[PDB]
């Protein structure tokens with residue numbers, strides 16, 4: 001898992017930490033502005049590792065993008081003992097987006113669903129249930145059911161994940177790089 005030049009455990013007391021555009025350090029020695037920079041470094045590095053895994057020319061997640069857009073990230077820290085300064089396992093980034101979405105009749109619909117915009121679990125610990133734990137937490141906090149989500153450019157791994165954990169299989173064909181499932185328009 002990803003290690004940093006600072007104490008991750010002190011920075012993030014909870015196993016899953018929710019952050020928005022304000023990048024607020026969880027409550028409660030280092031100055032607030034310095035804690036905020038630590039958070040920014042974490043988000044930047046997570047964004048980079050995700051991008052490299054998805055073969056992207058540039059990250060779609062970074063600290064600066066987070067603030068200027070108004071997206072929300074959920075960050076899962078490592079529960080095992082790695083030195084002793086803690087570590088980060090992965091994250092999921094969500095946000096509402098206005099989209100034109102095709103239905104089963106091939107008509108375009110104006111909608112604004114919650115979208116899964118980025119999602120990454122460290123390669124070394126994938127397939128150990130971390131992705132499900134993070135996803136479940138996000139669902140409970142965001143108050144949405146899985147079939148109401150739009151998924152941005154999902155990988156084959158993520159499609160298999162959604163079918164396994166949430167029985168999401170049947171898609172409604174789109175032209176815009178988002179994926180939606182049957183029941184989205186329900």
Ligand SMILES: CC(C)(COP(=O)(O)OP(=O)(O)OC[C@H]1O[C@@H](n2cnc3c(N)ncnc32)[C@H](O)[C@@H]1OP(=O)(O)O)[C@@H](O)C(=O)NCCC(=O)NCCS
Pocket residue numbers: 050053054117118119120121122125126127128129130131132133152153154155156157158160161162164
């Ligand atoms: C997608 C991802 C977040 C899944 O998280 P995870 O912690 O591996 O997921 P979990 O352990 O909770 O769930 C495991 C299930 O996910 C799916 N999955 C995970 N890794 C997989 C792989 N290498 N091949 C096929 N399916 C996979 C499978 O359905 C798997 O179930 P199985 O092991 O019974 O086949 C993680 O694989 C990842 O970071 N992938 C790279 C980034 C990415 O693809 N993001 C999606 C585009 S935004």
